[PDB]
């Protein structure tokens, strides 16, 4: 009728990924006996995991990116690296001004610049100017950090790695093209997935993708209301994936902070 | 007698990397003509390269990073991805206070966090805590962007991709280990280089790296002076390279803004 306290679960959740939610005990002394035994059990397995990294070096995040890069490369996508700084006017083009709920989540650098909370601003600009240099499909994507202000015990990261791809002039059907790129992304992760195409009024069609019943991304297809503000006048398709959450699901990790850019974790193992 | 306008020089440096500094003409009529013809020629050459990226997608920055990654991995290095936010305490351990000349160019987020202007802060903590998990050599490196406030003359970038490697607990001669790693990076970019080794102290030895008599990097081997502030008490080696300036020298670009993270350049070609 008693189990772990609120701060000894926190140590077990830092060195291990298993759910100690309902592991009951006889008394307050029996709960302390297994905590110390399990706390050292995870601590030493966490130690041997990093010893394996030192013997067989690798970076889980880089390895995943390079597989996504080479799958999208077979489809004819150009990888671009856009700046992290974005303008106040670019954010205003995406309806993101003071009345928008995402406005208070924005890290401002000066009165005119901020850290990008998404890739749409820079990809809208790049994909349109590429249209000036070709009459065929524009296929670009980017992998890099975006930033948002968050609650401090919230599960969401303040800096997270986003993968956003977009095709601006599909030679085939734009929705079928996006579904095929989804499958390319999922095979790089190694998981199977569920897709559910659903209607919407502000896009032409929406594609909700989910892994094990958990929605992880939603793609758009067709002309959007914000297109004329970016001088875009053709049907397009695109979707964004959070890469830390994908690693967390593939590796059964406790939370997204264990797989992202961090000074306390490395390939999922704790450093201190 | 007469030579190019300053406005004409800027136009030709935005579409080409050729030096039109010392070309002279008869008078204004002949100067205004070669400009219009060179400008039109550079544009279609710039256009022809963008069409080649569309026909054969690539990204010179990713292509170089991965080549560096796989050469360092053969040496037993571990790629780590650390956060971009850093505390003002972590900077203070690096003597980056109001006293320091780097303080003025620091991008602050709030009063206790800033955007990293170098990789030393985060690499200090990851290399030290990995000592708690092995007795042999500690080898890590990061490829990521750091931020510094620059003036509007702006021939240094505000966001630049830094490559910083660290070898701790040498396992051999640390200086020749560093000499070798430099050759690995230089073979990845594909340039002939020279070295210059001077004696900082009885403890540390510095090594300067120049490409075409232009210094591109500075490294130190031994017990660094800021080690006690990070609980580090053993010799190590490290050096950082600007990935943009390296790409600028190999491809002969006119300035590093054509090779970095940009919305106007894509593999060195202008988009607008």
Numbering used by the authors:
A (entry chain B), B (entry chain A): 2 to 273
Q: What did the paper state?
A:
The PylSc-type PylRS from the methanogenic archaeon ISO4-G1 (ISO4-G1 PylRS) is highly similar to MaPylRS with 64% sequence identity, while ISO4-G1 PylRS and MaPylRS both share around 38% sequence identity with M. mazei PylRSc. The genome of the methanogenic archaeon ISO4-G1 encodes an ISO4-G1 PylRS protein consisting of 273 amino acids, which is quite similar to MaPylRS.
The crystallization of the ISO4-G1 PylRS protein was successful when using PEG3350 as the precipitant, and the crystal structure of the ISO4-G1 PylRS apo form has been determined at 2.78-Å resolution. The asymmetric unit contains ten molecules of PylRS (five PylRS dimers, A/B, C/G, D/F, E/H, J/I). On the other hand, when Tyr204 is located inside the amino acid binding pocket (the closed conformation), the imidazole ring of His225 shifts and is stabilized by a π–π stacking interaction with the aromatic ring of Tyr204. In ISO4-G1 PylRS, the Met128 side-chain protrudes into the amino acid binding pocket, which would reduce the pocket size as compared with that of MmPylRSc.
